[PDB]
């Protein structure tokens, strides 16, 4: 059984460069993520000797 | 055969600038998931002592 909790710190940038539209910025923030996982697995083996 | 659920509200913060008028944009997103993984495996080993 597995459960994942991750927060990713998201950062971008906003730069426009054209003939009549320019402007600069920088962004910052953090996200959230909560997971949950069950796992079922079996086996077999036959070993002669 | 495992099944992964991940429930997130990923919130990003973005501020955008222009030539005269500057605004911003934040947004978070709720969601669901059934990202399941199935597997099939075969093996073979020979030892000698």
Numbering used by the authors:
A (entry chain C), B (entry chain D): 295 to 343
Quote the original article:
The toxin functions as a binary A2B toxin, with enzymatic A factors, lethal factor (LF, 91 kDa) and edema factor (EF, 89 kDa), and a cell binding B factor, protective antigen (PA, 83 kDa). Within the endosomal compartment, the acidic environment induces a conformational change in the PA, resulting in the formation of a β-barrel channel that can insert itself into the endosomal membrane.
The available space on the heptameric PA channel for EF binding can only accommodate up to three EF molecules due to steric hindrance. Indeed, 2D classification of cryo-EM images of PA channel bound with EF showed that the EF binding varies in different classes, suggesting that the space is not fully occupied. Therefore, we used a symmetry expansion method in Relion for 3D classification and were able to resolve the asymmetrically attached EF. Unlike LF, all the domains of EF are well resolved in our channel complex structures. Upon PA binding, these disordered residues of EF (residues 20–30) refold into an α-helix (EFN α1) and bind within the α-clamp site. β1 (Leu33 to Lys35) of EFN forms parallel β-sheet with β13 (Leu203 to Pro205) of PAN. LF α1 is angled downward towards the pore in the α-clamp site, while the amino-terminal end of EF α1 is elevated ~2.9 Å as measured using the carbonyl groups on LF Glu34 and EF Glu24. This change in the orientation of Phe464 appears to restrict EF α1 in its elevated conformation in the α-clamp site.
